[PDB]
Amino acid sequence: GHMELKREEITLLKELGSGQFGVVKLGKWKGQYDVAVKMIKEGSMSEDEFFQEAQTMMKLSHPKLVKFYGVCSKEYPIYIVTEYISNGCLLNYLRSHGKGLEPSQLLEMCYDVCEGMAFLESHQFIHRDLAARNCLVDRDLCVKVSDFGMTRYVLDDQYVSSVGTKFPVKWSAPEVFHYFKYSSKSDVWAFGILMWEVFSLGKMPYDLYTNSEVVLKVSQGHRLYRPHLASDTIYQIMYSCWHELPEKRPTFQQLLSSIEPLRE
Template identity: 45%
Template sequence: GTWNGTTKVAVKTLKPGTMSPEAFLEEAQIMKRLRHDKLVQLYAVVSEEPIYIVTEFMSQGSLLDFLKDGDGRYLKLPQLVDMAAQIAAGMAYIERMNYIHRDLRAANILVGDNLVCKIADFGLARLIEDDEYTARQGGNSP
């Protein structure tokens, strides 16, 4: 779609039976709190049925499809390393804000023009308490 007649946007809608409206809207709340140039930007939320989340449009789609079937198949190592660094910058921001994504994978990274990568799909993200993920002394790490 188009936002304000000028900006291309992606419109995510809640498909019946996939998740609760509350969980879907919680993703929008997280996206509102997390603002970074390596995270997909939230533009608007329609919170009444039918529920929609309006985000920035990423022209190349998911990183998974881009690397498997798109122009990403022809990238060289320096370009791939730059893309990985962009993703790491976004994840570092999420960590600084005391959130964890919990579903980082190529399908949840979106690619735009000029190989810009942004983290998307905050459906499983959650706020963590300061000591929640601190390793306990003598404990085993997974």
């Protein structure tokens, strides 16, 4: 229906990079709009998994989530057409341009992600890999969360199996790495790690340690230290995301309103 786009109305231009689940190309849609098109190869992911994903992305429209326009699914490679977010990946942006940012700009990046995540949370979805590598930066430095192939339906205070794509353990809550289960607060833990990445200008978390070491250290109570550019108030907010128990972590709704008075 409205989800299907006219393939002849998409012209692909240069490769932008890769992520997911697929190479991403810059494109033009209807000879007017700049788009980023993800290529879904035949066999790369399931046919029926694709429909559920495309529908979920279409449903979840928010200014802080990558805008989905439609798909070209009649032939392979399947196109996933989205808005082109000109400054690309947040992680690369922090690494290349982070020194030029004010701490108030770093907080605004965290606020943007939180606002998009509060929207997902209000719809009973979690993000399975909330990290700077899955966020994009637009021309005005507004941050958008990329959620394709990385969401999971979970009712509040309930647990669901972690079975599927194994995402980086340094962004994983203990219920994930220990019990192979997601809670409605598993992405809140990841969001605290994302705030740490932002305020650290894209440094790797626990950079001295292997994944095996991190699982042990985190189980023992060890946490990431305060990034130099983070105020103690901002550190207390990220730190609150890392309670061993999901019940003790804030929701994104609480995080959002905690960040709101600290802006500019």
